Amino acid sequence: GMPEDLDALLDLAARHGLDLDGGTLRTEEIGLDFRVAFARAHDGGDWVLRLPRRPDVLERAAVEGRLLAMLAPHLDVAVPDWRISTSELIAYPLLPGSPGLTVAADGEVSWHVDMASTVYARSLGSVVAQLHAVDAEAAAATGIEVRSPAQVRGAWRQDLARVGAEFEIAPALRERWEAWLADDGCWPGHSVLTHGELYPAHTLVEDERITAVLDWTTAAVGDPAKDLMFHQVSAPSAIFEVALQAYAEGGGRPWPGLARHCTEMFSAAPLGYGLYALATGEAAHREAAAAALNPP
Ligand SMILES: CC[C@H]1OC(=O)[C@H](C)[C@@H](O[C@H]2C[C@@](C)(OC)[C@@H](O)[C@H](C)O2)[C@H](C)[C@@H](O[C@@H]2O[C@H](C)C[C@H](N(C)C)[C@H]2O)[C@](C)(O)C[C@@H](C)CN(C)[C@H](C)[C@@H](O)[C@]1(C)O
Ligand SMILES: CC[C@H]1OC(=O)[C@H](C)[C@@H](O[C@H]2C[C@@](C)(OC)[C@@H](O)[C@H](C)O2)[C@H](C)[C@@H](O[C@@H]2O[C@H](C)C[C@H](N(C)C)[C@H]2O)[C@](C)(O)C[C@@H](C)CN(C)[C@H](C)[C@@H](O)[C@]1(C)O
Ligand SMILES: Nc1nc2c(ncn2[C@@H]2O[C@H](COP(=O)(O)OP(=O)(O)O)[C@@H](O)[C@H]2O)c(=O)[nH]1
Ligand SMILES: [Cl-]
Ligand SMILES: [Cl-]
Ligand SMILES: [Mg+2]
C-alpha cells in the first residue's frame, strides 16, 4: 500500500542518495521495530527500505549492521547489503527469490514452498551448517548477545520462573517444560552463531532452493537447534533427516536429542508470548499469553 507519509520518505531517501520512483514505493510489512517498504529507483534498481519506528531501535540496528558486514563473505546465500545505514534510514538492494511463506497483517499465512520438499531441506541444512561454522569470537565482536551452553539452558530456566511469577501456567505444561529443562540429552554441548528467527518468511527461494536469508536482528551466539526448530516441527521426520544429513555434511554437529529438543522448545512458545506481553504491557498481549499458558 501507498504510504501516507510518501512525500517525506522520498525526501528522506533522496537526502541519502537514493532517487526513488515514488509511484513504486509501497509498504510491505510493519514490524515491531521496522516498517519495511519496497521501491524502485529511477535507474531501475529495486530497493528495500527499513524505517526505524522509534529511536530505541537504533543501537540494535547498528549491531545488526556490524553483523551483516562480517557475515556476508561466509555464506553461499545472499544477505541484506545495507548500502544506506543511518539513524533515519536503512536500505539495501532487493534480494532475489520469493519468500518461502508470507504472513499477512491479518495473521493469515500464504505458503510458497512446501515443507515436505527434499530440495528445501537439503538447502536449509547446508545454509545452517555454513552459518554455524562462522567463528563465534569474530561474531561476538559485532556486539550480538552471546550465551554459552550453560547460559542457554539457564536463560530458559529463568524465563520459566519469570513467566510463572506473572501468569497462571497449566500444571501439565509446567511439568513438561521442567522435564525438558531437566533432560541433559536435549541440550546442546556447544554454542554457535545463530540467526534466531529462521523460518521460511525469512528464506527467499527459487526452485525450492534458498537464495537469500533476511532479517538478522535476532542473531546471537547460542543454541544451534534454534535455527532448525521450525523445520523440525513442520517437516515430516524423514525430511528433517535430509536437513540433518546436509547439516552434518557441512560440518554441523547435531546431537541425538536435537529433534526432540526442537519439539519441546516449540511447545514452550507460550513462554515467549508471556515474555513479550511483559515487555509491551498491552492488555491484548497479556490475555493472549494467559490463554496460551493455561490451555483448555
Ligand atoms: C521494487 C518495488 C516493487 O516491488 C516489487 O517489485 C516486489 C519485490 C515484487 O516481487 C518481485 C519479485 C518476485 C520474485 O516476487 C517476490 C517476482 O515473482 C515478482 C513478479 O516481482 C512484488 C512482491 C510482486 O510479486 C508478487 O507479490 C506476491 C506477494 C508474491 C508473488 N509470488 C509469490 C508469486 C509475486 O508475484 C508484485 C506483483 O509486484 C506485487 C504487486 C501487488 C505490485 N506491487 C505493489 C508494486 C507495484 C511493486 O511493483 C513495487 C512495490 O513497486
Ligand atoms: C536462483 C537459484 C540459484 O540462486 C542463485 O543464483 C544465488 C542468488 C547465487 O547468487 C547469484 C547472484 C550473484 C550476483 O551473487 C549474489 C552472483 O555473483 C552469483 C554467482 O550467483 C548464490 C547466492 C551464489 O553465492 C554467492 O556467490 C557470490 C559470488 C558471493 C556470495 N557471498 C559469499 C558474498 C555468495 O552468497 C552461488 C554461487 O550460486 C552459491 C552456490 C554455492 C549455490 N548455487 C550454485 C545455487 C545452486 C544457485 O545457483 C541457485 C540457488 O540455484
Ligand atoms: N523478495 C524480497 N522480500 C523481502 C526482502 N526483504 C524483506 N522482504 C519481505 O519483507 C518482509 C519483512 O522484512 P523483514 O526484514 O523480515 O523485516 P521485519 O518487519 O522487521 O520483520 C520479509 O519477511 C519478506 O517478506 C527482499 O530482499 N526480497
Ligand atoms: Cl511506523
Ligand atoms: Cl539461544
Ligand atoms: Mg522479519
Tab-separated table of C-alpha atoms and ligand atoms in Angstrom:
chain	number	residue	atom	x	y	z
A	1	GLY	CA	0.000	0.000	0.000
A	2	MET	CA	0.841	3.689	-0.737
A	3	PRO	CA	2.394	5.228	2.406
A	4	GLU	CA	0.586	8.195	3.899
A	5	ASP	CA	3.994	9.814	4.511
A	6	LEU	CA	5.101	9.013	0.920
A	7	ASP	CA	6.203	12.621	0.499
A	8	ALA	CA	8.664	12.698	3.428
A	9	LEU	CA	10.003	9.232	2.589
A	10	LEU	CA	11.062	10.283	-0.926
A	11	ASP	CA	12.789	13.324	0.586
A	12	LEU	CA	14.485	11.109	3.182
A	13	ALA	CA	15.726	8.649	0.578
A	14	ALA	CA	16.938	11.435	-1.750
A	15	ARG	CA	18.851	13.039	1.117
A	16	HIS	CA	20.707	9.683	1.326
A	17	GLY	CA	21.453	9.415	-2.395
A	18	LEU	CA	18.556	7.157	-3.387
A	19	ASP	CA	16.386	8.647	-6.163
A	20	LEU	CA	13.168	6.644	-5.994
A	21	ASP	CA	10.137	6.494	-8.285
A	22	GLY	CA	7.512	7.396	-5.712
A	23	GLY	CA	4.774	5.514	-7.503
A	24	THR	CA	6.584	2.237	-6.792
A	25	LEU	CA	7.088	2.856	-3.049
A	26	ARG	CA	4.732	0.580	-1.086
A	27	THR	CA	4.739	-0.602	2.492
A	28	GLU	CA	5.369	-4.363	2.654
A	29	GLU	CA	5.303	-5.134	6.376
A	30	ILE	CA	5.101	-3.181	9.617
A	31	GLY	CA	7.223	-4.926	12.219
A	32	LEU	CA	7.626	-4.269	15.920
A	33	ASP	CA	10.874	-2.332	15.227
A	34	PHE	CA	10.997	-1.510	11.498
A	35	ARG	CA	8.498	-0.502	8.863
A	36	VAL	CA	9.659	-2.265	5.671
A	37	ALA	CA	8.868	-0.910	2.160
A	38	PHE	CA	9.807	-1.872	-1.411
A	39	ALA	CA	10.655	0.719	-4.060
A	40	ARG	CA	12.281	1.047	-7.479
A	41	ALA	CA	14.940	3.647	-8.239
A	42	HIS	CA	14.726	5.744	-11.365
A	43	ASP	CA	17.849	3.916	-12.642
A	44	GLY	CA	15.820	0.684	-12.495
A	45	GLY	CA	17.302	-0.880	-9.350
A	46	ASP	CA	14.951	-2.397	-6.793
A	47	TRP	CA	15.316	-1.491	-3.132
A	48	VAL	CA	14.134	-2.446	0.348
A	49	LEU	CA	13.692	0.418	2.848
A	50	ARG	CA	13.837	-0.280	6.615
A	51	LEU	CA	12.398	2.598	8.605
A	52	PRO	CA	13.071	2.561	12.369
A	53	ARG	CA	9.857	3.162	14.261
A	54	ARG	CA	11.433	4.504	17.483
A	55	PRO	CA	14.908	5.745	18.446
A	56	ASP	CA	15.365	2.837	20.905
A	57	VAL	CA	15.720	0.550	17.856
A	58	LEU	CA	18.918	2.210	16.653
A	59	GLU	CA	21.581	0.532	18.748
A	60	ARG	CA	20.233	-2.917	17.852
A	61	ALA	CA	20.178	-1.872	14.211
A	62	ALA	CA	23.828	-0.792	14.453
A	63	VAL	CA	24.808	-4.212	15.870
A	64	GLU	CA	22.910	-5.952	13.069
A	65	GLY	CA	24.760	-3.841	10.537
A	66	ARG	CA	28.115	-4.872	12.007
A	67	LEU	CA	26.980	-8.496	11.978
A	68	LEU	CA	25.932	-8.354	8.332
A	69	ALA	CA	29.215	-6.783	7.257
A	70	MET	CA	31.300	-9.607	8.779
A	71	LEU	CA	28.815	-12.374	7.908
A	72	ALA	CA	28.173	-11.938	4.184
A	73	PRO	CA	31.501	-13.396	2.867
A	74	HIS	CA	30.944	-16.605	4.823
A	75	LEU	CA	27.598	-17.689	3.311
A	76	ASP	CA	26.569	-19.059	-0.114
A	77	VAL	CA	23.221	-17.301	0.139
A	78	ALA	CA	22.743	-13.534	-0.162
A	79	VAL	CA	22.122	-11.426	2.948
A	80	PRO	CA	20.955	-7.778	3.063
A	81	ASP	CA	23.696	-5.388	1.898
A	82	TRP	CA	22.939	-2.194	3.791
A	83	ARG	CA	24.274	0.320	1.269
A	84	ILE	CA	22.499	3.021	3.249
A	85	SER	CA	22.569	2.731	7.007
A	86	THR	CA	21.898	5.793	9.157
A	87	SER	CA	19.810	6.702	12.175
A	88	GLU	CA	16.959	7.693	9.851
A	89	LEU	CA	17.073	5.024	7.115
A	90	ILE	CA	18.432	1.616	6.229
A	91	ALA	CA	18.177	0.482	2.630
A	92	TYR	CA	19.500	-2.494	0.696
A	93	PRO	CA	19.130	-3.804	-2.856
A	94	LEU	CA	16.198	-6.167	-3.182
A	95	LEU	CA	17.428	-9.757	-2.766
A	96	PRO	CA	16.413	-12.349	-5.374
A	97	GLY	CA	13.882	-15.154	-4.871
A	98	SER	CA	10.464	-15.442	-3.310
A	99	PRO	CA	9.729	-15.705	0.438
A	100	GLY	CA	9.018	-19.319	1.370
A	101	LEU	CA	5.927	-18.064	3.129
A	102	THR	CA	4.326	-14.687	3.787
A	103	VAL	CA	2.381	-13.700	6.928
A	104	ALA	CA	-0.217	-11.025	6.247
A	105	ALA	CA	-1.149	-8.256	8.672
A	106	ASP	CA	-4.371	-10.192	9.468
A	107	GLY	CA	-2.193	-13.179	10.514
A	108	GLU	CA	-3.159	-15.489	7.619
A	109	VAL	CA	-0.228	-17.364	6.053
A	110	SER	CA	0.428	-17.972	2.360
A	111	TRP	CA	2.896	-20.773	1.566
A	112	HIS	CA	5.215	-20.738	-1.430
A	113	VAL	CA	7.460	-23.702	-0.556
A	114	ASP	CA	6.196	-26.971	0.882
A	115	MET	CA	7.884	-28.368	3.994
A	116	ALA	CA	7.909	-31.884	2.528
A	117	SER	CA	10.446	-30.651	-0.056
A	118	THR	CA	13.715	-32.629	-0.073
A	119	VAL	CA	15.369	-29.828	-2.089
A	120	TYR	CA	14.389	-27.227	0.516
A	121	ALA	CA	15.529	-29.485	3.386
A	122	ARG	CA	18.947	-30.021	1.811
A	123	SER	CA	19.313	-26.314	1.110
A	124	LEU	CA	18.334	-25.361	4.657
A	125	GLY	CA	20.683	-27.899	6.265
A	126	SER	CA	23.544	-26.628	4.097
A	127	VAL	CA	22.976	-22.915	4.790
A	128	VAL	CA	22.600	-23.536	8.517
A	129	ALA	CA	25.867	-25.512	8.580
A	130	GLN	CA	27.666	-22.609	6.887
A	131	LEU	CA	26.267	-20.121	9.390
A	132	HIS	CA	27.074	-22.387	12.304
A	133	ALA	CA	30.684	-22.593	11.060
A	134	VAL	CA	31.308	-18.851	11.422
A	135	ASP	CA	33.957	-18.088	14.008
A	136	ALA	CA	31.994	-17.236	17.147
A	137	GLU	CA	34.646	-14.867	18.576
A	138	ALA	CA	34.575	-12.856	15.371
A	139	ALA	CA	30.792	-12.814	15.588
A	140	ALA	CA	30.821	-11.761	19.260
A	141	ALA	CA	32.967	-8.750	18.345
A	142	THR	CA	29.958	-7.246	16.469
A	143	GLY	CA	28.084	-6.729	19.750
A	144	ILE	CA	25.475	-9.508	19.420
A	145	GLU	CA	24.316	-11.399	22.505
A	146	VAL	CA	26.475	-14.384	23.493
A	147	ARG	CA	25.425	-17.383	25.576
A	148	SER	CA	27.452	-20.491	26.446
A	149	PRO	CA	25.565	-23.841	26.551
A	150	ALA	CA	25.081	-23.405	30.293
A	151	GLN	CA	23.736	-19.877	29.797
A	152	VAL	CA	21.350	-21.074	27.039
A	153	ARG	CA	19.777	-23.564	29.433
A	154	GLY	CA	19.940	-21.090	32.322
A	155	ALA	CA	18.050	-18.479	30.283
A	156	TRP	CA	15.174	-20.870	29.642
A	157	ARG	CA	15.064	-21.827	33.332
A	158	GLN	CA	14.974	-18.132	34.265
A	159	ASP	CA	12.254	-17.427	31.692
A	160	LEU	CA	10.019	-20.203	33.094
A	161	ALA	CA	10.422	-18.640	36.534
A	162	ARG	CA	9.774	-15.075	35.399
A	163	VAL	CA	6.679	-16.032	33.394
A	164	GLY	CA	5.325	-18.283	36.165
A	165	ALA	CA	5.551	-15.410	38.621
A	166	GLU	CA	3.235	-13.289	36.440
A	167	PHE	CA	0.872	-15.842	34.812
A	168	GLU	CA	-1.034	-18.979	35.777
A	169	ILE	CA	0.639	-21.845	33.893
A	170	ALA	CA	-1.251	-25.082	33.374
A	171	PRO	CA	0.334	-27.759	35.610
A	172	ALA	CA	0.729	-30.189	32.691
A	173	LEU	CA	2.632	-27.556	30.683
A	174	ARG	CA	4.872	-26.618	33.599
A	175	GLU	CA	5.681	-30.282	34.212
A	176	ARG	CA	6.519	-30.859	30.545
A	177	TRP	CA	8.850	-27.844	30.428
A	178	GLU	CA	10.512	-28.797	33.744
A	179	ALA	CA	11.107	-32.271	32.392
A	180	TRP	CA	12.643	-30.746	29.245
A	181	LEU	CA	14.928	-28.448	31.272
A	182	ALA	CA	15.992	-31.405	33.359
A	183	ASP	CA	16.882	-33.732	30.416
A	184	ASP	CA	20.591	-33.415	29.537
A	185	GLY	CA	20.038	-35.354	26.321
A	186	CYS	CA	18.076	-32.476	24.836
A	187	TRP	CA	20.529	-29.660	25.436
A	188	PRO	CA	23.445	-28.572	23.180
A	189	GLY	CA	27.036	-29.034	24.288
A	190	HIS	CA	28.310	-26.160	22.110
A	191	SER	CA	27.162	-22.674	21.086
A	192	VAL	CA	27.351	-21.251	17.545
A	193	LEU	CA	26.393	-18.130	15.685
A	194	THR	CA	22.642	-18.415	15.082
A	195	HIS	CA	20.061	-16.487	13.110
A	196	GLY	CA	17.381	-16.752	15.814
A	197	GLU	CA	14.255	-16.448	13.703
A	198	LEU	CA	15.000	-18.847	10.851
A	199	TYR	CA	11.740	-19.925	9.167
A	200	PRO	CA	10.502	-19.579	5.576
A	201	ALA	CA	9.322	-15.952	5.860
A	202	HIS	CA	12.998	-15.069	6.088
A	203	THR	CA	14.367	-17.575	3.485
A	204	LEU	CA	13.924	-16.498	-0.118
A	205	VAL	CA	13.806	-19.378	-2.578
A	206	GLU	CA	13.892	-20.225	-6.252
A	207	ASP	CA	13.005	-23.771	-7.394
A	208	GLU	CA	12.852	-24.720	-3.693
A	209	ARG	CA	16.484	-23.725	-3.028
A	210	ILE	CA	17.398	-20.887	-0.677
A	211	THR	CA	18.815	-17.835	-2.432
A	212	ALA	CA	18.868	-15.361	0.456
A	213	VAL	CA	18.253	-15.102	4.199
A	214	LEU	CA	16.592	-11.978	5.607
A	215	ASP	CA	16.181	-10.190	8.944
A	216	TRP	CA	19.203	-10.704	11.142
A	217	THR	CA	18.093	-8.638	14.144
A	218	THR	CA	17.859	-11.731	16.388
A	219	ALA	CA	21.354	-13.061	15.583
A	220	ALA	CA	23.261	-14.257	18.638
A	221	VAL	CA	25.765	-16.885	19.718
A	222	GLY	CA	23.681	-19.634	21.287
A	223	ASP	CA	21.770	-22.885	20.724
A	224	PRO	CA	22.312	-24.466	17.263
A	225	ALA	CA	18.883	-26.093	17.421
A	226	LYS	CA	17.005	-22.805	17.285
A	227	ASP	CA	17.760	-22.454	13.526
A	228	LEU	CA	16.485	-25.948	12.790
A	229	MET	CA	13.404	-25.834	15.040
A	230	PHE	CA	10.831	-24.564	12.608
A	231	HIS	CA	11.774	-27.239	10.075
A	232	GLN	CA	11.720	-29.971	12.698
A	233	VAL	CA	8.203	-29.145	13.789
A	234	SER	CA	6.823	-28.525	10.276
A	235	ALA	CA	8.506	-31.167	8.062
A	236	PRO	CA	7.904	-34.952	8.104
A	237	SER	CA	10.575	-36.689	10.207
A	238	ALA	CA	12.102	-38.330	7.120
A	239	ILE	CA	12.562	-34.869	5.536
A	240	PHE	CA	14.051	-33.364	8.686
A	241	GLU	CA	16.568	-36.221	8.454
A	242	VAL	CA	17.510	-34.908	4.976
A	243	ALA	CA	18.201	-31.499	6.544
A	244	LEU	CA	20.201	-33.122	9.360
A	245	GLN	CA	22.277	-35.031	6.834
A	246	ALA	CA	23.027	-31.835	4.868
A	247	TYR	CA	23.845	-30.072	8.143
A	248	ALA	CA	26.319	-32.760	9.125
A	249	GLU	CA	27.876	-32.838	5.670
A	250	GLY	CA	28.560	-29.122	6.039
A	251	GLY	CA	30.344	-29.574	9.360
A	252	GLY	CA	27.374	-29.197	11.706
A	253	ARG	CA	27.423	-31.280	14.894
A	254	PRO	CA	23.833	-32.342	15.669
A	255	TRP	CA	23.174	-34.450	18.784
A	256	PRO	CA	20.757	-37.389	19.096
A	257	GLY	CA	18.294	-35.453	21.246
A	258	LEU	CA	18.186	-32.459	18.869
A	259	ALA	CA	14.882	-33.313	17.133
A	260	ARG	CA	13.154	-33.831	20.457
A	261	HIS	CA	14.710	-30.645	21.831
A	262	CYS	CA	13.183	-28.758	18.871
A	263	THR	CA	9.748	-30.102	19.564
A	264	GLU	CA	9.988	-29.355	23.346
A	265	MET	CA	11.263	-25.839	22.532
A	266	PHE	CA	8.267	-25.228	20.225
A	267	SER	CA	5.865	-26.453	22.923
A	268	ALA	CA	7.317	-23.659	25.085
A	269	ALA	CA	6.242	-20.930	22.659
A	270	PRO	CA	3.781	-19.672	25.349
A	271	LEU	CA	6.745	-18.612	27.483
A	272	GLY	CA	7.790	-16.304	24.666
A	273	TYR	CA	4.274	-14.940	24.467
A	274	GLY	CA	4.364	-14.282	28.201
A	275	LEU	CA	7.753	-12.521	27.952
A	276	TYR	CA	6.501	-10.419	25.031
A	277	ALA	CA	3.388	-9.364	26.955
A	278	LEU	CA	5.571	-8.418	29.954
A	279	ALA	CA	7.619	-6.199	27.642
A	280	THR	CA	4.762	-4.436	25.849
A	281	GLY	CA	2.387	-4.134	28.764
A	282	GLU	CA	-0.531	-4.254	26.361
A	283	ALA	CA	-3.821	-5.804	27.516
A	284	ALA	CA	-4.392	-7.906	24.386
A	285	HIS	CA	-0.916	-9.399	24.606
A	286	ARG	CA	-1.335	-10.302	28.268
A	287	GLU	CA	-4.633	-12.021	27.533
A	288	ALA	CA	-3.201	-13.917	24.542
A	289	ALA	CA	-0.263	-15.101	26.683
A	290	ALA	CA	-2.574	-16.025	29.584
A	291	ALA	CA	-4.734	-18.161	27.289
A	292	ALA	CA	-1.688	-19.850	25.723
A	293	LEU	CA	-0.154	-20.608	29.125
A	294	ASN	CA	-3.272	-22.360	30.515
A	295	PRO	CA	-4.982	-24.075	27.572
A	296	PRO	CA	-8.422	-25.911	27.827
B	1	LIG	C1	10.527	-2.933	-6.209
B	1	LIG	C2	9.176	-2.210	-5.893
B	1	LIG	C3	8.057	-3.097	-6.394
B	1	LIG	O1	8.022	-4.232	-5.517
B	1	LIG	C4	8.416	-5.477	-6.234
B	1	LIG	O2	8.789	-5.490	-7.388
B	1	LIG	C5	8.279	-6.790	-5.402
B	1	LIG	C6	9.636	-7.204	-4.917
B	1	LIG	C7	7.542	-7.750	-6.293
B	1	LIG	O3	8.181	-9.043	-6.380
B	1	LIG	C8	9.021	-9.248	-7.486
B	1	LIG	C9	9.971	-10.371	-7.202
B	1	LIG	C10	9.364	-11.730	-7.357
B	1	LIG	C11	10.463	-12.860	-7.286
B	1	LIG	O4	8.425	-11.943	-6.304
B	1	LIG	C12	8.894	-12.000	-4.969
B	1	LIG	C13	8.625	-11.845	-8.653
B	1	LIG	O5	7.964	-13.128	-8.740
B	1	LIG	C14	7.572	-10.775	-8.772
B	1	LIG	C15	6.852	-10.891	-10.096
B	1	LIG	O6	8.170	-9.443	-8.695
B	1	LIG	C16	6.120	-7.871	-5.704
B	1	LIG	C17	6.212	-8.568	-4.373
B	1	LIG	C18	5.292	-8.579	-6.806
B	1	LIG	O7	5.251	-10.010	-6.655
B	1	LIG	C19	4.192	-10.813	-6.224
B	1	LIG	O8	3.941	-10.498	-4.817
B	1	LIG	C20	3.391	-11.617	-4.039
B	1	LIG	C21	3.370	-11.238	-2.619
B	1	LIG	C22	4.205	-12.881	-4.252
B	1	LIG	C23	4.104	-13.280	-5.661
B	1	LIG	N1	4.779	-14.596	-5.885
B	1	LIG	C24	4.715	-15.426	-4.706
B	1	LIG	C25	4.140	-15.325	-6.996
B	1	LIG	C26	4.688	-12.213	-6.524
B	1	LIG	O9	4.450	-12.472	-7.912
B	1	LIG	C27	4.098	-7.738	-7.271
B	1	LIG	C28	3.171	-8.441	-8.279
B	1	LIG	O10	4.727	-6.671	-7.960
B	1	LIG	C29	3.248	-7.150	-6.119
B	1	LIG	C30	2.108	-6.219	-6.694
B	1	LIG	C31	0.994	-6.204	-5.744
B	1	LIG	C32	2.557	-4.766	-7.133
B	1	LIG	N2	3.494	-4.009	-6.141
B	1	LIG	C33	2.726	-3.401	-5.055
B	1	LIG	C34	4.257	-2.917	-6.699
B	1	LIG	C35	3.645	-2.355	-7.958
B	1	LIG	C36	5.685	-3.352	-6.963
B	1	LIG	O11	5.945	-3.323	-8.336
B	1	LIG	C37	6.692	-2.437	-6.275
B	1	LIG	C38	6.314	-2.261	-4.808
B	1	LIG	O12	6.696	-1.141	-6.921
B	2	LIG	C1	18.337	-18.581	-8.494
B	2	LIG	C2	18.716	-20.006	-7.976
B	2	LIG	C3	20.198	-20.033	-7.668
B	2	LIG	O1	20.427	-18.994	-6.701
B	2	LIG	C4	21.495	-18.045	-7.125
B	2	LIG	O2	21.911	-17.996	-8.284
B	2	LIG	C5	22.036	-17.150	-5.962
B	2	LIG	C6	21.227	-15.898	-5.934
B	2	LIG	C7	23.537	-17.031	-6.130
B	2	LIG	O3	23.976	-15.675	-6.360
B	2	LIG	C8	23.968	-15.321	-7.737
B	2	LIG	C9	23.960	-13.836	-7.893
B	2	LIG	C10	25.305	-13.213	-7.691
B	2	LIG	C11	25.245	-11.691	-8.118
B	2	LIG	O4	25.684	-13.329	-6.305
B	2	LIG	C12	24.814	-12.710	-5.383
B	2	LIG	C13	26.353	-13.907	-8.486
B	2	LIG	O5	27.639	-13.351	-8.142
B	2	LIG	C14	26.393	-15.373	-8.133
B	2	LIG	C15	27.441	-16.066	-8.965
B	2	LIG	O6	25.100	-16.019	-8.413
B	2	LIG	C16	24.242	-17.605	-4.865
B	2	LIG	C17	23.878	-16.708	-3.710
B	2	LIG	C18	25.765	-17.712	-5.113
B	2	LIG	O7	26.508	-17.432	-3.909
B	2	LIG	C19	27.112	-16.166	-3.787
B	2	LIG	O8	28.254	-16.139	-4.702
B	2	LIG	C20	28.831	-14.790	-4.760
B	2	LIG	C21	29.938	-14.880	-5.734
B	2	LIG	C22	29.303	-14.445	-3.336
B	2	LIG	C23	28.189	-14.514	-2.337
B	2	LIG	N1	28.654	-14.268	-0.920
B	2	LIG	C24	29.769	-15.099	-0.488
B	2	LIG	C25	29.070	-12.864	-0.654
B	2	LIG	C26	27.564	-15.878	-2.375
B	2	LIG	O9	26.420	-15.853	-1.491
B	2	LIG	C27	26.077	-19.128	-5.564
B	2	LIG	C28	27.484	-19.118	-6.142
B	2	LIG	O10	25.177	-19.577	-6.581
B	2	LIG	C29	26.009	-20.128	-4.389
B	2	LIG	C30	26.275	-21.619	-4.805
B	2	LIG	C31	27.051	-22.296	-3.769
B	2	LIG	C32	24.961	-22.440	-4.973
B	2	LIG	N2	24.303	-22.148	-6.343
B	2	LIG	C33	25.068	-22.833	-7.397
B	2	LIG	C34	22.881	-22.453	-6.343
B	2	LIG	C35	22.586	-23.860	-6.851
B	2	LIG	C36	22.165	-21.359	-7.143
B	2	LIG	O11	22.560	-21.390	-8.496
B	2	LIG	C37	20.635	-21.353	-7.061
B	2	LIG	C38	20.162	-21.456	-5.605
B	2	LIG	O12	20.045	-22.428	-7.822
B	3	LIG	N1	11.514	-10.608	-2.060
B	3	LIG	C1	12.067	-9.978	-1.013
B	3	LIG	N2	11.328	-9.804	0.093
B	3	LIG	C2	11.873	-9.169	1.180
B	3	LIG	C3	13.247	-8.649	1.154
B	3	LIG	N3	13.474	-8.042	2.343
B	3	LIG	C4	12.318	-8.169	3.073
B	3	LIG	N4	11.394	-8.814	2.341
B	3	LIG	C5	9.990	-9.136	2.738
B	3	LIG	O1	9.634	-8.202	3.744
B	3	LIG	C6	9.320	-8.895	4.948
B	3	LIG	C7	9.798	-8.070	6.106
B	3	LIG	O2	11.226	-7.957	6.083
B	3	LIG	P1	11.991	-8.239	7.440
B	3	LIG	O3	13.438	-7.947	7.188
B	3	LIG	O4	11.636	-9.629	7.933
B	3	LIG	O5	11.563	-7.111	8.472
B	3	LIG	P2	10.687	-7.076	9.817
B	3	LIG	O6	9.298	-6.375	9.513
B	3	LIG	O7	11.465	-6.325	10.813
B	3	LIG	O8	10.333	-8.486	10.221
B	3	LIG	C8	10.053	-10.233	4.819
B	3	LIG	O9	9.515	-11.317	5.620
B	3	LIG	C9	9.872	-10.538	3.359
B	3	LIG	O10	8.505	-10.935	3.067
B	3	LIG	C10	13.985	-8.917	-0.087
B	3	LIG	O11	15.159	-8.505	-0.226
B	3	LIG	N5	13.348	-9.557	-1.098
B	4	CL	CL	5.606	3.495	11.680
B	5	CL	CL	19.994	-19.317	22.434
B	6	MG	MG	11.155	-10.456	9.707
